[PDB]
Design an enzyme around this catalytic site. Structure first.
Site, mmCIF file in Angstrom:
data_model
loop_
_atom_site.group_PDB
_atom_site.id
_atom_site.type_symbol
_atom_site.label_atom_id
_atom_site.label_comp_id
_atom_site.label_asym_id
_atom_site.label_seq_id
_atom_site.Cartn_x
_atom_site.Cartn_y
_atom_site.Cartn_z
ATOM 1 N N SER A 114 0.796 -1.226 0.000
ATOM 2 C CA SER A 114 0.000 0.000 0.000
ATOM 3 C C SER A 114 0.819 1.261 0.000
ATOM 4 C CB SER A 114 -0.927 0.026 1.226
ATOM 5 O OG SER A 114 -1.894 -1.001 1.133
ATOM 6 N N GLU A 136 -4.450 -8.435 -6.268
ATOM 7 C CA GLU A 136 -3.328 -9.203 -6.812
ATOM 8 C C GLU A 136 -1.962 -8.579 -6.602
ATOM 9 O OE1 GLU A 136 -6.057 -8.346 -8.486
ATOM 10 O OE2 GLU A 136 -7.072 -10.275 -8.884
ATOM 11 N N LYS A 141 2.849 6.501 5.040
ATOM 12 C CA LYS A 141 1.964 5.549 4.421
ATOM 13 C C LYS A 141 2.518 4.131 4.604
ATOM 14 C CE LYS A 141 -1.534 3.798 2.354
ATOM 15 N NZ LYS A 141 -1.445 2.785 3.424
ATOM 16 N N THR A 142 1.719 3.287 5.244
ATOM 17 C CA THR A 142 2.080 1.898 5.553
ATOM 18 C C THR A 142 1.768 0.959 4.402
ATOM 19 O OG1 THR A 142 -0.144 1.686 6.475
ATOM 20 C CG2 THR A 142 1.627 2.170 7.941
ATOM 21 N N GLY A 143 2.337 -0.239 4.475
ATOM 22 C CA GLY A 143 1.910 -1.329 3.589
ATOM 23 C C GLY A 143 2.104 -2.682 4.210
#
Length: 260
Positions: A39, A135, A201-203
């Site tokens: 993300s 995906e 911003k994390t992912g």
């Protein structure tokens, strides 16, 4: 060897790149190693959206349906009947990591191939957007689809937020969204002293991938831009947020930032 120690304590691979925009000093550990960006790509995607639209054009209402919802839709699942503006989609994407919002925004800019082209235009030859959610989270070791590096994500996030890929009012929207992110309190934010403003911003993705990218402002001074990326050997691996928090603490000490 504190980054190595964290890899040992957490059974993970770290990718670190940090730039003090005040001094040009740098902290790097596997800075050119690829990871699934997960993300974190949402932040760059909004940068591209902003470049392509006036502020007023963000008030465009996007109508969508249930089939636009995917695996994580905390905001978009509530507004199917009314739609959401582009501005609201950007908010949802950045502050809640709403996956359907990212897809809708991607659609408005012409898809992953279009995103890639705009990223090349701002000078990022590394970040490789190829697919939509869900995906894009599925990246196997050694694959390059939907990956980037810590150095490239820092370079690109700096370019949009702090340099001249956007005009000042659009930089401000991006920054304010990321400052008010709800998903990052246990990551970079947890490794920076209280009161210091953080935009992040994390992912999270397969192979225990767990990422955060950020701009960090001391009380006075130029900001630091940082990417802390991580991944593990097993496809269904768990991550631990503390890895990212502790890595951040190492970066801050290495930059002589603790304290000021």
């Amino acid at each position: 060897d504190d980054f190595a120690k964290l890899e040992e304590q957490f059974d993970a691979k770290l990718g670190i790149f940090a730039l003090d925009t005040g001094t040009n000093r740098t902290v790097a550990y596997r800075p050119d190693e690829r990871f699934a960006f997960a993300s974190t790509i949402k932040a760059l995607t909004v940068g591209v959206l902003l470049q392509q639209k006036s502020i007023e054009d963000l008030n465009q209402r996007i109508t969508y349906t249930r089939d636009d919802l995917v695996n994580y839709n905390p905001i978009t699942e509530k507004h199917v009947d009314t739609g959401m503006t582009l501005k609201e989609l950007a908010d949802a994407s950045l502050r809640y990591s709403d996956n359907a919002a990212q897809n809708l925004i991607l659609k408005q800019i012409g898809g992953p191939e279009s995103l890639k082209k705009e990223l090349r235009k701002i000078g990022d030859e590394v970040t490789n957007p190829e697919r939509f959610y869900p995906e894009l989270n599925e990246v196997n070791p050694g694959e390059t689809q939907d990956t980037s590096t810590a150095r490239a994500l820092v370079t690109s996030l700096r370019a949009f937020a702090l340099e001249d890929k956007l005009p000042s009012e659009k930089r401000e929207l991006l920054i304010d969204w990321m400052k008010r992110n709800t998903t990052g309190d246990a990551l970079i934010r947890a490794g920076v002293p209280d009161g210091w403003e953080v935009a992040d911003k994390t992912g999270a993705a397969s192979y225990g991938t767990r990422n955060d990218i950020a701009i960090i402002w001391p009380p006075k001074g130029d900001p630091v831009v940082l990417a802390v990326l991580s991944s593990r050997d097993k496809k269904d691996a768990k991550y631990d947020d503390k890895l990212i928090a502790e890595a951040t603490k190492v970066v801050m000490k290495a930059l002589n930032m603790n304290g000021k």
